[PDB]
A = this chain, B = another copy of it.
């Protein structure tokens, strides 16, 4: 099943948001329009300190009219290596360097209207290389921020769940025959 684009019209081209509408041909020969936001995507980092606290930053989010606590993340620049962007983000936003930075998962944030993709990485073995909006939380503190709706966006909820699973699964070992 595929919706072939016959024509694209740009509605808006901003510093964050590009909006376009595609005239598309349905497999039945009917035609219709698809509103599409284009977004360069983002890299995000789950950084877990040697005290096992997850590193976070408080950001003001104008669309929500509130500040929320998030894992660090940066815009992916044109043709840039996401892992390189990830490492720049750890240092610039938290002032931490790591020993490893490894890709965990990639996902769309809202594929019903946007093509934005998040690339989620895990940084382990942190040490420092100033930071007013920097917050380090224990796992239990993070779960409490979720209860409080201070943590409140997809990618940060996924990171907290990941830390949770890493604790809950740390003895797992399957031996098949």
For A74-113 the 0/1 string (1 means CB < 8 A from B) is 0000000000000000000000000000000111111111
> Is chain A's interface secondary structure helix, strand, loop, or mixed overall?
mixed
Task: Give the distance to chain B from A143, nearest Cβ to Cβ, in Å.
Answer: 11
Interface check A128, CB cutoff 8 A: no
Tell me the chain A residues, 18-65 only, with Cβ under 8 Å from chain B.
19, 21-22, 24, 33-37, 39, 60-64
Contact of A1 among B24, B33, B67 (CB under 8 A): B67
> Beyond A19-B12, A154-B108, A158-B154, is A39–B113 a contact (Cβ under 8 Å)?
yes
Tell me the chain A residues, 123-161 only, with Cβ under 8 Å from chain B.
146, 149, 152-155, 157-158, 161
CA A146 to CA B158, docked complex, whole Å: 14
Q: Is the Cβ of A108 less than 8 Å from the Cβ of B153?
A: yes
CA A5 to CA B91, docked complex, whole Å: 32
Chain B residues with Cβ below 8 Å from A12 are 11-12, 19, 35
Chain B residues with Cβ below 8 Å from A60 are 1-3
Task: Give the distance to chain B from A164, nearest Cβ to Cβ, in Å.
Answer: 6
Interface check A122, CB cutoff 8 A: no
Nearest residue (CB) in B for A19 is: B19
> Beyond A1-B60, A63-B37, A67-B1, is A109–B154 a contact (Cβ under 8 Å)?
yes
Q: Is the Cβ of A22 less than 8 Å from the Cβ of B162?
A: no
Chain B residues with Cβ below 8 Å from A62 are 3, 22, 24, 34, 36
> Beyond A11-B11, A11-B19, is A157–B35 a contact (Cβ under 8 Å)?
no
Which of the listed residues A22, A24, A111 has the most CB atoms from chain B within 10 Å of its own CB?
A: A111
A/B interface sample: 5 pairs, CB < 8 A: A11-B11, A16-B35, A64-B108, A114-B114, A168-B168
